[PDB]
Amino acid sequence: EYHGFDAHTSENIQNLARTFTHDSFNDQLNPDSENFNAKFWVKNLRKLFESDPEYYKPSKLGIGYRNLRAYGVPTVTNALWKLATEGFRHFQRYFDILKSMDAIMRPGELTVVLGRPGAGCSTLLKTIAVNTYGFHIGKESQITYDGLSPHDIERHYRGDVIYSAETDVHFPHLSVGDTLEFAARLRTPQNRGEGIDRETYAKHMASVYMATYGLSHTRNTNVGNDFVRGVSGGERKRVSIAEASLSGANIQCWDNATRGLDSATALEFIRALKTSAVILDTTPLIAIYQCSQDAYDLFDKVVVLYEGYQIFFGKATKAKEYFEKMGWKCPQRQTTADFLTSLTNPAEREPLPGYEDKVPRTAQEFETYWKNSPEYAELTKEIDEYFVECERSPASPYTVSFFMQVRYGVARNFLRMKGDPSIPIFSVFGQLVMGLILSSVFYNLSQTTGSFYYRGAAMFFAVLFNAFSSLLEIMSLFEARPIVEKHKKYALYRPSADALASIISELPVKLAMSMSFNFVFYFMVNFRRNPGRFFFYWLMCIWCTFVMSHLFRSIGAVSTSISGAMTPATVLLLAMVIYTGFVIPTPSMLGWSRWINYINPVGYVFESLMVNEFHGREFQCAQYVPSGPGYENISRSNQVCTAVGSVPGNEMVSGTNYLAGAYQYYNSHKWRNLGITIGFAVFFLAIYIALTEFNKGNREIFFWRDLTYQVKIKKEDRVILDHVDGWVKPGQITALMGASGAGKTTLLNCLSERVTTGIITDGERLVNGHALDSSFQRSIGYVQQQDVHLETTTVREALQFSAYLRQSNKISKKEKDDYVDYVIDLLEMTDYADALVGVAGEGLNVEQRKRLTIGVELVAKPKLLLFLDEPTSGLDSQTAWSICKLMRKLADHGQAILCTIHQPSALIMAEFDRLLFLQKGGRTAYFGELGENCQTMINYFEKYGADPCPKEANPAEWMLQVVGAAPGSHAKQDYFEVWRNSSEYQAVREEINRMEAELSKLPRDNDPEALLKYAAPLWKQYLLVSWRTIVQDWRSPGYIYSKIFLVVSAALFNGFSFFKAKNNMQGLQNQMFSVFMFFIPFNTLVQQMLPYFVKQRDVYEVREAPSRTFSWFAFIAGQITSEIPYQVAVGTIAFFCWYYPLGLYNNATPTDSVNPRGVLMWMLVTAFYVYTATMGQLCMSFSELADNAANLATLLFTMCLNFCGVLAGPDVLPGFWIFMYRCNPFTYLVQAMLSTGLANTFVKCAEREYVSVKPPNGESCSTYLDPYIKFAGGYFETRNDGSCAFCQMSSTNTFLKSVNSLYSERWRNFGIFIAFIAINIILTVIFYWLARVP
Ligand SMILES: CCCCC/C=C/C/C=C/C/C=C/C/C=C/CCCC(=O)OC[C@H](COP(=O)(O)O[C@H]1[C@H](O)[C@H](O)[C@H](OP(=O)(O)O)[C@@H](OP(=O)(O)O)[C@@H]1O)OC(=O)CCCCCCCCCCCCCCCCC
């Protein structure tokens, strides 16, 4: 709790000053002397120890204006159309949002803007803080900032005026001390100063400001977010205030900073603002709606708006009186702020007796009265004097140079990495493990020509493993964007400085990754062993990773989520991967494709690495074309190697010749490519910095008796509820009230059987005098506090779903629909019945969402109770009053309601019928009728001895004060003892006994349908959930279109890079790697898909799981079935976009089997596109976060791809890894695909693959080579030289057999893949049961 600038804070500041004066070395300012006052010390410290520069930085600002006037101006099947319309709107009236006003705010005054939502307070505070982005300002207006101008403030005085409204953006894993010290050190001036180190001064600044705002205790504690634990809810707002004050802000504007915050938290926040205004001369503006009287007693000035009209402005204490002079009536026990706010509501409010004709009803009449009043005349006189006085009388807003900003950014980034080493450790160790595994695949490559291909493959993947190694770093960019924006607004540092700091801070991680991967890969794979070759390889890999890191940062500087950046960048990254130079060697490159390789930053890296390895090297020949049983005694001059650069009669193959023939790489480009890659890195770094700088912007009565409830905590059991008894009757509302530690929520959850812990010892809950049965949990509705709804379901659809799945199965659909309509009418939801729920920003209000939740829990027809968990909490005064009226209407119709109420207003409290009050230890203190204006309750606490309640006061707070639960109060008597020793308790016990003895004889109603766990059969639940998920996926905003575009673009690029392809010895390998690259969109698809699984899982587990709507099996089966249709359609599109451009059907013409092979390939592609979804869901079933599931799925996919039989077959793989070659799901898909697409067709060798053979003297190639052609496949062509050209392949079956793919085993492989899909589904279900189902 915060008490302001109390004596304790003064003593703490005294101790801090005493500590600091020793390092540093009027009667005040002496820590060791008497009568020293902390306020004067803090005030003078800023002006004295900060020195005086030659600029005109002001220490206080006040704002005055005279005539301020401000004016202004789905289903995917239609989305594209809408976009087109939007485009037309981009191809090519005048209403005042804020009418004329007059105001003046001076330093040291806390000002509050009041008004109902939509009045225009947010726009006024945006205008004051110079944030007019979305509306214009009238030319007649005149705004003066203590003599400056709005343009002057915006241009080179920013940071003096700040505007933060609702959500605080802090680094969750940075401690409060570090968070404040960062700003303190970034704001201190480096221009000399005093004989004190700057770091010491920043530390003293941070300590003093922590002490001032009561945060000294919360040092070295993570600030945290709504997810990460830390400073709970109110110390974070004070941290934000302290940080804003440290940055020199002099006019701080807040809009509903205390939104969804209880009265105590808002009161302490406003207290912190008041001390900020008092100690440090400041002009804070606050826009609040639910403000307590104690909080309102702190405000210095109030301005009240009526639809942006500013009916009144002036001293807060004189506000009510003025309006009471107007002719309005203020009901007693009503806070002044609520009275002022409701005076603008025609439905509420009422005039004084005899004033029914003099008060105004229109905002225009309100302005007329305001202007005619003498208060407006005095205000105008003051404004004129202020403007006359102001008229009579820094290059950049930042304080430290660019180098200092980037240095501090680097330090903060290191602190963040220390506070969360997850991503760096994961990246480093993933690189290490992947390098180890991949090297195990390529272990100890031979020195003969037979290793050529493998060597190339290695130097390809190494490049890839350096290109994408730094993909995860961009995640940090998505976490620091809001904070960087805020600090730019605060005028602390530029986004460019933060970008450079982020680049510099990740160098250690990049070095660790590069070392851990390369030092193992380059050496366990038998590459060139010379030191110079290794060092050149390492240098090129370093530059490749820098280039790709800068490219990834550039892509992620204009994106908000990993999937959002991944979807459009997937095509680009796949294009760079394909055109590296290995999948499609330059000789095989098509006409339209070469320009892609010319501008590829990775092609040059690959060329340099291959040139470095192969140039100036001789490889021993492995195979000679003429060989076998008939050529066991043939001369070496009549033979020739089978490589590309082979020369007849030579026993060795030159690396230079092979490189110049197969890949067309030359040694002249070894060092030039390094310069090209350096240029690419610099270019991408410049683009990234520019982007991050510029591109930014009933009949049964339920009663409990002797309910005792205890829970074991750390081997110790403490009773949370001690002998709590009561009842709930139809037609009455009972309010469950208590302190924070009174455990009223525990009582509510124990009564409703929604608490999974503890044991009830002496309790007894009964209905109509009978013990509880198995039908209880289905006869009580539970309206949770938080509203968890699907964003893609209309109100009517949600109500219909609940009614269908929760009402009796013997009731026809017509009755269910009619009851849904009746509930919609009763809750006054008919105006927006067919409106998407959407998100909080766009969609339904908080009131509408709460009404929808009550309706959802009402259409189930609960016949016993409606437990409401804090309905009037986190809501405005008027919205809370409306919801209370709705609850009263429900209770009128014949309902029984029990609700827990937290910090209510007097008017709200007067609406309830009965009250159950609990004090520490769950001890009942009162249980009885509230009476009129809570009078009866008061009598109970007044006739037993206590301080009489004031005539004007809130009885809700009076109760807490009386029982000692309020902060700063004395009980003076244990009220449990008097309650147990009262006549009221005896009456309650007698009533409970009478009810138990009487109602137990009533004839109960028996029906087995009510005893079932679920009201609908399993198949119906499965169907309904599957349909809901399908509709949600369809209606998501750009989810199906993103998938379609990604898959279509990737498939088209992969199928047209390999346009109709010659079946030469190299073309077959190119097509095999085309099949291999066809699987790359797996990661992007999983990343896109997982969040929409998270949404449904959250909605189910938070609300639908305990409500017993549908079982876990129905949920998981629906999730599994929802993705099959979309995946099948996308797979069909992908197959049509890839199979035909590749021209594979030509291979089927010779054997006449065109249709079967095309059909089988379509099945295989669709099966892969279903398997990707099944595997993503399997990896997501047991995991908690979407990022972890996506990363695990990517790891498993990479492992499956490594041992899929393309990089190295079973005969090359180590015996240890064969277990992964057989259990792979892709080792069969790839075999089936290759077999279907390539089998049973001829092969024609390219001009560069023909191998020259010189027959022995006196022989022709026919006679000399037919025995070999018979022994092994191939063909030969005569030449006009005496030699002849031999091609080692005559049919594609030879290549397929080499890859270990057979034509007769395609259907078996398809069946095995289907079996793997089934295993994935089964494991998904089982793991979801094991991990998530309680
Ligand atoms: C913030 C970013 C941080 C990034 C990190 C910063 C890194 C900055 C480093 C700067 C250092 C730059 C050094 C470059 C100067 C090279 C001067 C000689 C160039 C040369 O000498 O290169 C041809 C010969 C052999 O190459 P080669 O196979 O082609 O054989 C040739 C023959 O030797 C002969 O000399 C004829 O050459 P020329 O006719 O003159 O062209 C021809 O003869 P033939 O082949 O025709 O028979 C052939 O080219 O290189 C060889 O020995 C081995 C290959 C170079 C060996 C140096 C490797 C240096 C690694 C740098 C450090 C890496 C660590 C990375 C980070 C560390 C910690 C984080």
Ligand SMILES: CC[C@H]1O[C@]2(CC[C@@H]1C)C[C@@H]1C[C@@H](C/C=C(\C)C[C@@H](C)/C=C/C=C3\CO[C@@H]4/C(=N\O)C(C)=C[C@@H](C(=O)O1)[C@]34O)O2
């Ligand atoms: C989660 C595991 C590790 O994952 C990354 C970053 C670091 C982690 C520890 C990143 C992966 C590649 C991976 C290391 C390299 C390989 C496994 C080699 C190769 C088989 C993988 C290529 C992957 C891709 C090619 O390019 C695709 C793409 N668009 O085409 C996008 C948007 C992302 C790529 C990707 O996400 O690659 C991609 O899926 O290192």
